Amino acid sequence: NIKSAKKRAIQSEKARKHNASRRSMMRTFIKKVYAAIEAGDKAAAQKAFNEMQPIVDRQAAKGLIHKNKAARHKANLTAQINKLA
Amino acid sequence: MVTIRLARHGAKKRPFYQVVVADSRNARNGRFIERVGFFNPIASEKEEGTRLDLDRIAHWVGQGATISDRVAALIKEVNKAA
Amino acid sequence: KIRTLQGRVVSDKMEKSIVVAIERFVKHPIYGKFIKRTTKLHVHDENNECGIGDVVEIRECRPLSKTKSWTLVRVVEKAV
Amino acid sequence: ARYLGPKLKLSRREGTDLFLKSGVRAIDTKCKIEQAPGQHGARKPRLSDYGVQLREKQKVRRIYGVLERQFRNYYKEAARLKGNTGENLLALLEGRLDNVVYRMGFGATRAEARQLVSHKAIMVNGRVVNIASYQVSPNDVVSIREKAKKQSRVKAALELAEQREKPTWLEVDAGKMEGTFKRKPERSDLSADINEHLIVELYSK
RNA sequence: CCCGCAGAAGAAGCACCGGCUAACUCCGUGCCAGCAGCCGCGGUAAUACGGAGGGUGCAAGCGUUAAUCGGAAUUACUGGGCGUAAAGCGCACGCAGGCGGUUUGUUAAGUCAGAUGUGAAAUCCCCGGGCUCAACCUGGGAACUGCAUCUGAUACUGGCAA
RNA sequence: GGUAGCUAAUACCGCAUAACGUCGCAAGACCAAAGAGGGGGACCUUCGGGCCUCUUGCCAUCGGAUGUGCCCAGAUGGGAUUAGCUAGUAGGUGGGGUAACGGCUCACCUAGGCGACGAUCCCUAGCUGGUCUGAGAGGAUGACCAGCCACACUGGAACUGAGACACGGUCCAGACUCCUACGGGAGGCAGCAGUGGGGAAUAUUGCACAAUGGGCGCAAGCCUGAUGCAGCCAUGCCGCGUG
Numbered sequence: 001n002i003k004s005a006k007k008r009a010i011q012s013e014k015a016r017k018h019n020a021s022r023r024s025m026m027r028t029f030i031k032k033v034y035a036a037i038e039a040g041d042k043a044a045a046q047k048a049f050n051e052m053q054p055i056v057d058r059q060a061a062k063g064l065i066h067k068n069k070a071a072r073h074k075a076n077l078t079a080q081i082n083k084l085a
Numbered sequence: 086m087v088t089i090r091l092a093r094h095g096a097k098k099r100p101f102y103q104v105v106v107a108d109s110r111n112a113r114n115g116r117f118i119e120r121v122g123f124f125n126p127i128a129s130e131k132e133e134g135t136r137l138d139l140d141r142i143a144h145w146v147g148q149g150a151t152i153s154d155r156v157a158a159l160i161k162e163v164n165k166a167a
Numbered sequence: 168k169i170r171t172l173q174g175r176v177v178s179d180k181m182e183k184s185i186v187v188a189i190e191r192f193v194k195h196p197i198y199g200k201f202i203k204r205t206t207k208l209h210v211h212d213e214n215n216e217c218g219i220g221d222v223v224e225i226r227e228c229r230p231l232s233k234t235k236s237w238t239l240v241r242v243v244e245k246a247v
Numbered sequence: 248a249r250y251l252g253p254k255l256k257l258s259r260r261e262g263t264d265l266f267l268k269s270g271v272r273a274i275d276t277k278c279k280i281e282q283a284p285g286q287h288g289a290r291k292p293r294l295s296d297y298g299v300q301l302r303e304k305q306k307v308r309r310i311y312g313v314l315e316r317q318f319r320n321y322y323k324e325a326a327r328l329k330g331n332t333g334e335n336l337l338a339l340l341e342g343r344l345d346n347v348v349y350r351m352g353f354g355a356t357r358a359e360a361r362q363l364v365s366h367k368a369i370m371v372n373g374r375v376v377n378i379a380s381y382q383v384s385p386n387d388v389v390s391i392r393e394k395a396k397k398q399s400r401v402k403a404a405l406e407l408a409e410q411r412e413k414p415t416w417l418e419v420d421a422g423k424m425e426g427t428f429k430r431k432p433e434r435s436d437l438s439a440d441i442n443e444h445l446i447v448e449l450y451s452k
Numbered sequence: 453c454c455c456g457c458a459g460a461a462g463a464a465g466c467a468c469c470g471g472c473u474a475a476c477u478c479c480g481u482g483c484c485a486g487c488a489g490c491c492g493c494g495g496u497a498a499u500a501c502g503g504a505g506g507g508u509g510c511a512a513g514c515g516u517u518a519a520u521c522g523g524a525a526u527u528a529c530u531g532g533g534c535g536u537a538a539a540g541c542g543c544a545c546g547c548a549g550g551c552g553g554u555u556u557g558u559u560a561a562g563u564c565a566g567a568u569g570u571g572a573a574a575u576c577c578c579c580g581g582g583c584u585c586a587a588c589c590u591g592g593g594a595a596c597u598g599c600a601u602c603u604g605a606u607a608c609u610g611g612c613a614a
Numbered sequence: 615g616g617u618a619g620c621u622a623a624u625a626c627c628g629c630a631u632a633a634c635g636u637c638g639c640a641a642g643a644c645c646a647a648a649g650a651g652g653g654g655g656a657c658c659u660u661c662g663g664g665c666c667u668c669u670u671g672c673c674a675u676c677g678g679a680u681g682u683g684c685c686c687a688g689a690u691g692g693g694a695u696u697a698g699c700u701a702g703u704a705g706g707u708g709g710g711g712u713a714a715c716g717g718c719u720c721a722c723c724u725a726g727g728c729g730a731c732g733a734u735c736c737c738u739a740g741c742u743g744g745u746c747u748g749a750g751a752g753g754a755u756g757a758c759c760a761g762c763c764a765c766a767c768u769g770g771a772a773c774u775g776a777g778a779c780a781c782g783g784u785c786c787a788g789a790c791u792c793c794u795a796c797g798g799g800a801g802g803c804a805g806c807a808g809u810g811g812g813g814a815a816u817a818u819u820g821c822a823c824a825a826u827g828g829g830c831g832c833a834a835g836c837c838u839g840a841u842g843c844a845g846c847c848a849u850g851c852c853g854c855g856u857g
Contacts (some may be wrong), residue, residue, distance in 0.1 A: 099589070
């Protein structure tokens, strides 16, 4: 068909690439922090949480996660990490 | 948004409007929240044919509603007195 | 206040679970008779306090799990 | 619509003067009453109850010159309103413009009154009325404009009007071929031959 | 929407005519030709078949069919029936249901009062307005025969105790 | 479609800032963004503009309204010549995923849940305010006008977006057609008109953006088979004429 939707599709695919990159970033950091939790160390996991918080909060404030998922992740991770020590 | 539009129910070649408040995305004469008044363009010599309720439209303006051109001209024509 | 209903147990006890039934009359829309009608729910309880064949009130709350939406408050006439 | 036929056929079949010919010699040679025309209409037909109802309906219909659908709608409207059904029906039917024009005396027969109405003659409140299905309202004025003025028909009708009884509910007026409507007519002034209840009984079934 | 032009001009059809249901007489046909919704009508006189004339019913429409409801009290609650017609099991004995003698208190769950919220606007209805008249549009009421909550009523059933 | 070299921006990304915001019994850690335009006597000007004003826009809070996303209770066709159905099935414990509780999913422990006051299983149908009929109770019915659902050749998935699993937006599988140098590719009138075909049988390959509305734009303006009017059809309800 011939409409104005072609540029819309192109923008959609570009957004797909960008959001996939950011999601991969997020998942890699989540996996590393869970690995540190499984390791059993306290200081290393606390440090990992420390550099990890800013990126997830940045992605939340950019408008990519709806601003509520970040709070759930942070609260659950803090509750999980403080008990094991 | 929330607007104040016009809708008709009359027969062919004989209009009869009925000013109402509803949602923009809905149809012309379909879903509506609450009627507020009416206007008869063809009218007659008789005085009746232009009525409103100023209190309710003022309240709805306060809540954050907008206005249409014809209804604005109408209310300017009547106001409390003009 | 808070609306309440009263019922009967006639139920086994699962882990933190009881089943209740309630009764009330109604007028049939056709013949004018009155017929007993029974309805059944599921309840979330605390410390499995109540037992078989006991009278207990009930009230609703947040949905907890499937088919379980009401919880008890007070128990009156303990045991049979 | 309209009848468009031999009127004295219905005059003779009914068995009573129908006032719809209204010449000058209202005499036997015109009518030949009590004959019941047809091939062998001399024989007495031995009416039955349903026949009595149907014949009364025919009489009341032909006297006022109306078809069937209008009559049924009139009965519906009369029954909707409050009060006695028969009296209300007759009062409503009397209110037709052609009938009041005839009763004022500007004509001789109801049919010629309707003919006058259809040709844009009768005047009310300074506005022309086209149709005879109009319902007159209390306290109105009936008059004739100047285009149809000086027509000998209305003068002849005025002169022959006085042979009738000039019903009280309407003011005869006619000083300058101008009149005045007063009120709804009632049972007393109209003729007592017509029986209301039988029509209602007929529409019952 | 008004004014003007000699101008009767340019304009009526369709069903039925035995009872049910408004209206009949002749000619030809003579168990062939045929109708019809039930009764059925027809072998020499058809008020029923074919034509003619009259009559009857509605009319810019009228008849035919298909489909829905009442006449149907023919699913019967308001409102039927079971000796002889279509109908009482072959008899008993007893869970689950339904229904209960008669006092005195308590209880408000039935039930009944009053208020509040809610039953979207068209339509159905009553007063009026407008389009020359209605059809059609429309101003204000009316009911949406319930639902939920709160306050009261205690004669009857219901749960309690004697 | 691919390769090489150039260029802006409210596009994109780091830093600066950080609280009634997020996480927190507690300190504490952490988070964001944008220019244009209308003029200008005085001032700087390396005469472009800075500078003085005015309109709109961007980013955080807390609130108003308006839609959408969930739960429960009661009503919502016919068949006992359909009597037993159901292991993620019913709960409990802990983790993961959504805007949110949740068998929404995972590993473990219990022995359950539903049913003669119709469960499972069959045939049949979109649902209401209503319409028709009858006095009332009822009985059939869901034509147009309103309200709500579920559906866009037939099966499944998601990205994008505030809001689809998207009617004229993508990707596969399938079957139809149409172009192909035969290696491949395009396509879904059940949107207003219309043809072929089913049938007793239902319209014209029409006008206007002037009225109201919808979407863009500070506005002027631009589209709009939404709509408002047309042409046909005794299809109904009306009113009239044939003296």
